[PDB]
Amino acid sequence: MMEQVCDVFDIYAICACCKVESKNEGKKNEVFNNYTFRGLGNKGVLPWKCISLDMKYFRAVTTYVNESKYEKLKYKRCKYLNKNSKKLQNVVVMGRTNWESIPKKFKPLSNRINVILSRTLKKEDFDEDVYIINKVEDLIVLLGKLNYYKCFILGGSVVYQEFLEKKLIKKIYFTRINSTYECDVFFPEINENEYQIISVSDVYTSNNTTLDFIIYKKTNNDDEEEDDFVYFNFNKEKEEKNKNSIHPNDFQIYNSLKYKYHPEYQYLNIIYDIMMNGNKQSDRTGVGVLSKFGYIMKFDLSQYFPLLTTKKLFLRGIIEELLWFIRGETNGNTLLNKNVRIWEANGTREFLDNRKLFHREVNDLGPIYGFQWRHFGAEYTNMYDNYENKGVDQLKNIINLIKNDPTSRRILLCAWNVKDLDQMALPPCHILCQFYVFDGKLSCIMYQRSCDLGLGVPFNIASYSIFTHMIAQVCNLQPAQFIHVLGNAHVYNNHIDSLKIQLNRIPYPFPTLKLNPDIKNIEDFTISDFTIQNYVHHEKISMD
Amino acid sequence: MMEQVCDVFDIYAICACCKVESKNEGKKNEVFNNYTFRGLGNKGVLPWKCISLDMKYFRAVTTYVNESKYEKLKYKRCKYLNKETKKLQNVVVMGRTNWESIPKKFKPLSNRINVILSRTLKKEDFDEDVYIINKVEDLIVLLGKLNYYKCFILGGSVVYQEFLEKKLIKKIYFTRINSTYECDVFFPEINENEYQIISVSDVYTSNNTTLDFIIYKKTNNDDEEEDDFVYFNFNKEKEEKNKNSIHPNDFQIYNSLKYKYHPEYQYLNIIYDIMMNGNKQSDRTGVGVLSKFGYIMKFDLSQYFPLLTTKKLFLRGIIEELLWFIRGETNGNTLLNKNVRIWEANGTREFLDNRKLFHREVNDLGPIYGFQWRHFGAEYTNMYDNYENKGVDQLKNIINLIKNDPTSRRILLCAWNVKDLDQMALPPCHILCQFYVFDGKLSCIMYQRSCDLGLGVPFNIASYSIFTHMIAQVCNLQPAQFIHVLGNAHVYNNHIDSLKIQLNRIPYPFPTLKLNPDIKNIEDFTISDFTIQNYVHHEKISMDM
Numbered sequence A: 001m002m003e004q005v006c007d008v009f010d011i012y013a014i015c016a017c018c019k020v021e022s023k024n025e026g027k028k029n030e031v032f033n034n035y036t037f038r039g040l041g042n043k044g045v046l047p048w049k050c051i052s053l054d055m056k057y058f059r060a061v062t063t064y065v066n067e068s069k070y071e072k073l074k075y076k077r078c079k080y081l082n083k084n085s086k087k088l089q090n091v092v093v094m095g096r097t098n099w100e101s102i103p104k105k106f107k108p109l110s111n112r113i114n115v116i117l118s119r120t121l122k123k124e125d126f127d128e129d130v131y132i133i134n135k136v137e138d139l140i141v142l143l144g145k146l147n148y149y150k151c152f153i154l155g156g157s158v159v160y161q162e163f164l165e166k167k168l169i170k171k172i173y174f175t176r177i178n179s180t181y182e183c184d185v186f187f188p189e190i191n192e193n194e195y196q197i198i199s200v201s202d203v204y205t206s207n208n209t210t211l212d213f214i215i216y217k218k219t220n221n222d223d224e225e226e227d228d229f230v231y232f233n234f235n236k237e238k239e240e241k242n243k244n245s246i247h248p249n250d251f252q253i254y255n256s257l258k259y260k261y262h263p264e265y266q267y268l269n270i271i272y273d274i275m276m277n278g279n280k281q282s283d284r285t286g287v288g289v290l291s292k293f294g295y296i297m298k299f300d301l302s303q304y305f306p307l308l309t310t311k312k313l314f315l316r317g318i319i320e321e322l323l324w325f326i327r328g329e330t331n332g333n334t335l336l337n338k339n340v341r342i343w344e345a346n347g348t349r350e351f352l353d354n355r356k357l358f359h360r361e362v363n364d365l366g367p368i369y370g371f372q373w374r375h376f377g378a379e380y381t382n383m384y385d386n387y388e389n390k391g392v393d394q395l396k397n398i399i400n401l402i403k404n405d406p407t408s409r410r411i412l413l414c415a416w417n418v419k420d421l422d423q424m425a426l427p428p429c430h431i432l433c434q435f436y437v438f439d440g441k442l443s444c445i446m447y448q449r450s451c452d453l454g455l456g457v458p459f460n461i462a463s464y465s466i467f468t469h470m471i472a473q474v475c476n477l478q479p480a481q482f483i484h485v486l487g488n489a490h491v492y493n494n495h496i497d498s499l500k501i502q503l504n505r506i507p508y509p510f511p512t513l514k515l516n517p518d519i520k521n522i523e524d525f526t527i528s529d530f531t532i533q534n535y536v537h538h539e540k541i542s543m544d
Numbered sequence B: 001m002m003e004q005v006c007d008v009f010d011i012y013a014i015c016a017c018c019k020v021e022s023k024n025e026g027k028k029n030e031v032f033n034n035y036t037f038r039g040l041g042n043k044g045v046l047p048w049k050c051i052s053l054d055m056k057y058f059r060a061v062t063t064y065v066n067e068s069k070y071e072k073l074k075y076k077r078c079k080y081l082n083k084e085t086k087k088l089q090n091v092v093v094m095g096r097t098n099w100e101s102i103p104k105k106f107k108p109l110s111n112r113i114n115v116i117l118s119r120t121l122k123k124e125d126f127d128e129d130v131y132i133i134n135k136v137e138d139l140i141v142l143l144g145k146l147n148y149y150k151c152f153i154l155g156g157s158v159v160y161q162e163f164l165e166k167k168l169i170k171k172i173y174f175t176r177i178n179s180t181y182e183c184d185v186f187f188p189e190i191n192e193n194e195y196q197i198i199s200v201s202d203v204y205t206s207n208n209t210t211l212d213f214i215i216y217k218k219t220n221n222d223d224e225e226e227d228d229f230v231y232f233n234f235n236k237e238k239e240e241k242n243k244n245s246i247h248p249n250d251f252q253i254y255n256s257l258k259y260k261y262h263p264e265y266q267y268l269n270i271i272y273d274i275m276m277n278g279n280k281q282s283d284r285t286g287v288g289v290l291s292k293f294g295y296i297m298k299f300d301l302s303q304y305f306p307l308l309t310t311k312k313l314f315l316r317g318i319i320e321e322l323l324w325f326i327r328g329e330t331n332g333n334t335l336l337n338k339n340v341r342i343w344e345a346n347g348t349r350e351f352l353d354n355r356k357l358f359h360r361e362v363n364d365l366g367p368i369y370g371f372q373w374r375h376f377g378a379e380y381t382n383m384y385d386n387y388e389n390k391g392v393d394q395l396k397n398i399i400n401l402i403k404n405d406p407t408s409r410r411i412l413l414c415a416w417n418v419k420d421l422d423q424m425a426l427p428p429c430h431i432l433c434q435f436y437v438f439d440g441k442l443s444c445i446m447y448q449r450s451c452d453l454g455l456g457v458p459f460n461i462a463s464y465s466i467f468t469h470m471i472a473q474v475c476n477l478q479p480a481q482f483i484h485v486l487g488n489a490h491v492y493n494n495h496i497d498s499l500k501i502q503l504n505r506i507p508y509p510f511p512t513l514k515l516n517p518d519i520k521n522i523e524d525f526t527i528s529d530f531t532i533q534n535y536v537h538h539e540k541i542s543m544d545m
């Protein structure tokens, strides 16, 4: 009898839930979880004007069918109940409210066996094509009498509630709309001991909101060229004589996902790869790390602002740092006065003395980033000197190149001034930036020589993504891709237990970055001109 | 539809071929083709002493079985013969001479059913658990009786030749041993109209020789998550919305390949991608190109020297250039006098004048590569000045870091001197190098801001690979990975047809690079300290019209 119904009839639930107003009165730093995305409808209608990509997804999922995989299902179904047209299709089940609130022109849902659960609707003022039922159970009855591929519960709040308690759902195809709307109906909370996420899609932007697609699974608690593949792997490694010390059940949730297309995984996979295959090395700091050489990450800034969601991140500091760079400053006190302590440790008397910069004032970081961006080649004296019109103003030059010669292959910003390296508190981690322009769109590649995956990298990603936006806007372009090239990529051994916790967390749709549209010159941005919207994230983690 | 015997009984050939000995035929300009690799044996034994990786491969292939796939093979063969419905093994057939060439301790071949073809010997002459058959026809009868997965013909030239003539071979698992040995027996010349290459493996080094594995095919002349995969791909392009007007048949051979693991495909695949998805842009030159932004290629220098084989490349010039860089030179005449014209066009009165370098002597390239490597920061005067001890000697610095502070994350070489750009005949294309050291091995990442896929890149790959070898050597390390990062990658429109031709050529196993081991200082290398061995390559290609 361990031959289940939702398994026999392949009943899935497909929905789309947005965020609901946190009720004017929630306590502290709003806490987030899967239940955050729960709004279904408001006043018999959808809570949002329209979201075409979900429509395209929904329609595509509920109508797709694989004929050469049906006999198997049909075989299973009769063998169980112990038992025409031929365009094999799907059963799309709805509630009255649901069916009613669907616009005229769309019913019956094209290429789908339309079914409707109402206690007052009658099959006569209807067709036959469109079936009608009495209660949950008169549905299973109608499927044993039909030829359908899969059955999808399109729903309504009630329809979802009844099908979940009645354990008649195999999978839930859940769309996460990352924006808020007022709603009077919600999707029942999903007990994580009952259902678990096995796949997360890529992140997209549709109708001025980001969204992604996840999949819930009911928890279980010519092949000559298929062989040729095995042959070509004759020399592979892992008899799992294992490697570093990292156990299986450590990344249980992480390894149990089938499809991990969320962009955040580009960052998580690198961490996993360093933990699993990294080389043990001693380091300038004496803590010990796991490192590898050469990784690439690509984020589509036209679809989302890649602020990591698997832990909390703050941006004031890094934005002030960026504005500090653009001004061409080298005075660490400017930042310290605004309580941005990113460079504090690099400006202490002791750190400077260790760099053999005995004649450098505390917090005078030398000819670093800012100085190189606006005065490459100028003679550095001290952080208070007047460097106006001295050296090569690279920033200004790249903006001009982007504006008057966008197909140039010399649009680069380089902070690595070989001649000045020793005079710097420390050489730049972010070596250079290259820009690319095509069809009104700007892409950027940043090469980083040293990457602290646990603490630094998340911030680096946000920093250059913001910077790409800034440059795009003051050049009348739309930002496209940000490409992060990592040279020496490492994970500090003291960050391992924290990163393990982070890898087993499932990303949320990304937030979006909004810049004051009025700013038209690279030098006119101020901290109030940046806004992060819809940042849904997991709780904070101290890496150490 | 007349079900062929080789398909019903799954009969395959597996061999290993080296290059044969013609001698000093005309090695300077000799021609290569698939028939280049054809040496099977010599004096009743193998031409070589022991290529262990091939042994491993040969063993993995001939003894591997997939149990769950047999029930269907059992049906197929029973159906055919009109019949009905210990551990599973494969059948291996070998000519008598072949059987006798194998060392006793390996016979019978482990975990495989052994079959020997012979007329002069019968079962009484063998102590081993083996089947003796005196006709090919008897093998078929035998395969009809036995329970086995697949049947592999290990041959002898006599055995290979006869199974091919009878059209009993479904696929040929062919190892290309890229080295020359004395031979007396050879694999039959494969007919291209009968067998086509469908797969090529990664390239490896074993017992002092590179080798790869290719597969020839006989020509005709959970599962609910499988659905989720379709769902997540709902937003993928239309077939008509794939950019450029490039044609199908134009990449017929290229796209017929099932497995393209040869490292050269990293290059070839980038070219394909740019032709299929590149952006049409004009450029500083006028020709116009197809460009994309950001690619990465990785080459394992410990397994091979990545010199492209789908077209001929000469290394004398780029080696001379590299030595020229290391000496810190900026004088173009130095290369011209060695008949290397790589920098000629960028040193003409005309080109220099167009760069506003009116006061620059012809061929005086300015503070480019070499100068930045040995004197970054120094004031450039002219190509004849003595720059000793001026500027930062980056090259010496990175060599000292690799030696005394190997875990440093600051081992970078940078030619992009922002202040000297305009004084340079032209800005550097290969912007920087970053080195990485672990367990006595040196890896290198080079970032290229602008890349001419058609002409530039093939030479750049070779250049830095040689440079990684040189640095590694003078630092007592072994070279590892050369990682090439491309920024603006483009293909000049005038190169498209030549590249269409290259993309349909199958790579050959890479050659190897040997450096005079006595050289221990980076500045002490001379052109003669470099030798490229076993470079098997396709015909030279004029990228131009």
Ligand SMILES: NC(=O)C1=CN([C@@H]2O[C@H](COP(=O)(O)OP(=O)(O)OC[C@H]3O[C@@H](n4cnc5c(N)ncnc54)[C@H](OP(=O)(O)O)[C@@H]3O)[C@@H](O)[C@H]2O)C=CC1
Pocket: A014, A015, A016, A017, A039, A040, A041, A042, A043, A044, A045, A046, A094, A095, A096, A097, A098, A099, A101, A117, A118, A119, A120, A121, A133, A134, A135, A136, A154, A155, A156, A157, A158, A159, A160, A162, A185
């Ligand atoms: N975000 C999403 O993915 C989706 C959102 N929606 C939104 O949800 C809202 C509709 O939800 P809601 O009001 O809960 O309505 P439902 O769509 O769940 O329909 C409820 C109605 O279905 C009938 N019904 C309920 N239970 C049973 C039963 N056991 N047997 C027979 N009939 C039954 C009743 O009809 P009767 O009164 O005649 O007895 C009932 O009032 C809308 O705003 C719609 O736009 C809808 C689908 C998907």
Ligand SMILES: NC(=O)C1=CN([C@@H]2O[C@H](COP(=O)(O)OP(=O)(O)OC[C@H]3O[C@@H](n4cnc5c(N)ncnc54)[C@H](OP(=O)(O)O)[C@@H]3O)[C@@H](O)[C@H]2O)C=CC1
Pocket: B014, B015, B016, B017, B039, B040, B041, B042, B043, B044, B045, B046, B094, B095, B096, B097, B098, B099, B101, B117, B118, B119, B120, B121, B133, B134, B135, B136, B154, B155, B156, B157, B158, B159, B160, B162, B185
């Ligand atoms: N590089 C590689 O992958 C391989 C290389 N080799 C090399 O090849 C050489 C051996 O090849 P080669 O000389 O061609 O010999 P083979 O190994 O093909 O053996 C030929 C002999 O096998 C027998 N034979 C072949 N066909 C038939 C048939 N139809 N009926 C009956 N007997 C048959 C005969 O045995 P008999 O004379 O007793 O009647 C015959 O003279 C060796 O140097 C070996 O090392 C071998 C296999 C693989």
Ligand SMILES: CCc1nc(N)nc(N)c1OCCCOc1ccccc1CCC(=O)O
Pocket: A014, A015, A016, A046, A054, A055, A058, A059, A098, A101, A102, A103, A106, A109, A110, A153, A154, A155, A175
């Ligand atoms: C809001 C879309 C939607 N999206 C997801 N991921 N799941 C649902 N269950 C769902 O709702 C389906 C119920 C209502 O469907 C519609 C509501 C308004 C217009 C059109 C349609 C469906 C059109 C179609 O299928 O062609």
Ligand SMILES: CCc1nc(N)nc(N)c1OCCCOc1ccccc1CCC(=O)O
Pocket: B014, B015, B016, B046, B054, B055, B058, B059, B098, B101, B102, B103, B106, B109, B110, B153, B154, B155, B175
């Ligand atoms: C050179 C090895 C070899 N390699 C390939 N790719 N194909 C062959 N047909 C082949 O030859 C197989 C014939 C004889 O095999 C041997 C010759 C000498 C020593 C050991 C063995 C085989 C040992 C084994 O299979 O365990």
